[PDB]
């Protein structure tokens, strides 16, 4: 199933997925399209901090949903 991630400048990823992936794999698929470590990435839908040993499925995570993208640098 296509899922969109909006990141927060204006940027938008196409990605291929499914229910059986988890939120680590994903993370770790989302590399690939911008290149981003999964270890600074962070995804939040409604306030919802999402957790890498979560699948798709404890969210619903369904088709035409957008998700959210978050930048958490390591230094600054």
Do not use: W
């Amino acid at each position: 199933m296509q899922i969109f991630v909006k990141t927060l400048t204006g940027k938008t990823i196409t990605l291929e997925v499914e229910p059986s992936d988890t939120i680590e794999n994903v993370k770790a698929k989302i590399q690939d399209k911008e290149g981003i470590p999964p270890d600074q990435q962070r995804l939040i839908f409604a306030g919802k901090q999402l957790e890498d040993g979560r699948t798709l499925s404890d969210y619903n995570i369904q088709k035409e949903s957008t998700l959210h993208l978050v930048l958490r640098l390591r230094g600054g």
